[PDB]
A paper describes a structure:
[FeFe]-hydrogenases represent one of natures’ most effective classes of redox enzymes catalyzing the reversible reduction of protons to dihydrogen (H2) at turnover frequencies of up to 9000 s-11–3. With their low catalytic over-potential, [FeFe]-hydrogenases represent excellent models for a regenerative and likewise economically feasible H2 production. Their active center (“H-cluster”) can be structured into a standard [4Fe-4S]-cluster ([4Fe]H) and a diiron site ([2Fe]H). In this study, site-directed mutagenesis (SDM) is used to investigate the PT pathway of two [FeFe]-hydrogenases, namely CpI and HydA1, which represent the largest (M3) and smallest (M1) type of monomeric [FeFe]-hydrogenases, respectively.
Unsurprisingly, protein samples of C169DHydA1 and C299DCpI both retain a rather high level of H2 release activity (30–80%). Interestingly, variant C169D and the corresponding variant of CpI (C299D) seem to be incapable of accumulating Hhyd under any of the conditions applied here. The strongest impacts were achieved when replacing E279CpI for A or Q, or C299CpI for A or S, resulting in activities <1%.
Author numbering: 2 to 580
The structure:
Amino acid sequence: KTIIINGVQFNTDEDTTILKFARDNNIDISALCFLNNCNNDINKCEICTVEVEGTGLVTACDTLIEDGMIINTNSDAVNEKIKSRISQLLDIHEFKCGPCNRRENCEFLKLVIKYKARASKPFLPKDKTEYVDERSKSLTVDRTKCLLCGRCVNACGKNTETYAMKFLNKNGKTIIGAEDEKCFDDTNCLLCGQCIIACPVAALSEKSHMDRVKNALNAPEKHVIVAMAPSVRASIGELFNMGFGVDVTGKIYTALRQLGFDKIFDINFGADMTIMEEATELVQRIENNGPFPMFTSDCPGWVRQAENYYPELLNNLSSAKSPQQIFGTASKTYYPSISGLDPKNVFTVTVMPCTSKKFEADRPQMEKDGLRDIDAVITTRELAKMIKDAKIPFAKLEDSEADPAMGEYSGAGAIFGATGGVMEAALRSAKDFAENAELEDIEYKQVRGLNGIKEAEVEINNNKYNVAVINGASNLFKFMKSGMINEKQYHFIEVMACHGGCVNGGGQPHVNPKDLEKVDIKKVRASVLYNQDEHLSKRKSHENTALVKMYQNYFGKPGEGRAHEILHFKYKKSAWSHP
Ligand code: 402
Ligand code: SF4
Ligand code: SF4
Ligand code: SF4
Ligand code: SF4
Ligand code: FES
Ligand SMILES: [Mg+2]
Ligand SMILES: [Mg+2]
């Protein structure tokens, strides 16, 4: 097939779209609603408009190339069509970039600038109350910014297959939202925030916890603890023009101190706690010959998936709390016992690449004696803004260290952020626990990587066991519906709602679509974590010295006693009822 684009002749064999073909040959074509290899098929944005001689204006993003095509991507007719579309989008868009949360990295703004489009009449609604939905504990919607591009709808379908994000007909007009315009929390929604990640504007955002955090630091009698997730140190640098795959761990500790936090800890410590409890439980089940399989319980998106679609699996979940909640429980119990602080005055803040983490934190029973495990959860994005609002020169900061007591971590805890991380981490301890040995070879590369469903046979104390890593919520549905769960007897299964693991969470920095093709964001972010694991001296959660002292002096033996009493959490299926 022979193609000519802007006068340049091409003789290729590729079967693909005009748009794909163009980008592969450094030919510029704008796009808006095209993402994840799909566009808005019932309301095409037409930003990708090109002209095919002998046919007219077409959409490049979903039109295949064809021998004999003469294509003009930059004619006046093309640009005025594109300009017209952007102008009409402006007609329903509160174009006030000043206090906007996507103002530094908005796709729509870049399009408005590129084509110099203006609205026929600006959209300045008086009362945004009717446009804003902040009911949810994890997500919020601002429909003054919504372009109706359907990227959230498509991403939810592709990433989770729940189709929790829908087009709705509100009073005769089209919006996006949850089923019957309910609060997402009350629907089958996983609160994974993959919809936010797909959004080209500030229409979708996390539920802000920043006021919680600010009030706590300004409150005289509050002792504010902060602890970031594995993934944060591997990605927050992106929002400070530092590039991708940059370890900024030390800079973060410094930034957090300058922000005024009273204690600097780390969720990787909690991750090591989770392994202590979860490896112990697995070994218990190995020698009780069940119940099998045990599922991980550290992903609140997956927890909600189970609660909403597979409640019969709830009893198979590990009782161990997530690194966030298990750290939190210790922060109100253990940490006062070694600091002299009144438990009531402790305010525990986590930094997460996750929106679902907010819902997990505000679960009614995630507390004891009136004290929440976790009082506030801010996303990676929220922390970035916080650092910028404080005008802290992040890229120029010098490295500091976390406070040891609940800040030290092993290599096992560090790789939690990647898909298969919990699996590898857990196996390192469980094998040592069951074999009563200090084992040399601890790398389980078979459970790593971006394959959606990953399996492996492991041999623990002279017995072969089957494990599986489920990489993404859509892949959970696949694994269960396809009957893969019954093809063999699995013993330990990891499930992460976000493909790639937490490094690809809904609270992570947005990445521009062109950069997404440019850089494998899931593997590059996770590489930071694995590199830490490789160069840490302690690579097993039970070799965490600060953790070992904690169990020795306070909790005792994991899996039983006081440790099982307050560090665990069990999910309950609803009893049978009609109707
Ligand atoms: N809690 C917890 Fe986890 C840990 O440690 C984070 O903390 Fe994750 C990350 N990064 C997130 O958010 S959650 C599911 N387990 C994998 S990693
Ligand atoms: S969504 Fe983008 S274009 Fe709209 S106000 Fe925010 S930054 Fe500006
Ligand atoms: S939070 Fe996740 S499950 Fe809910 S609508 Fe968004 S993408 Fe779908
Ligand atoms: S919420 Fe964002 S991604 Fe979804 S339709 Fe509106 S602008 Fe597009
Ligand atoms: S994979 Fe990580 S970021 Fe995504 S929903 Fe689960 S815990 Fe949250
Ligand atoms: S990007 Fe092609 S129609 Fe939207
Ligand atoms: Mg399509
Ligand atoms: Mg304070």
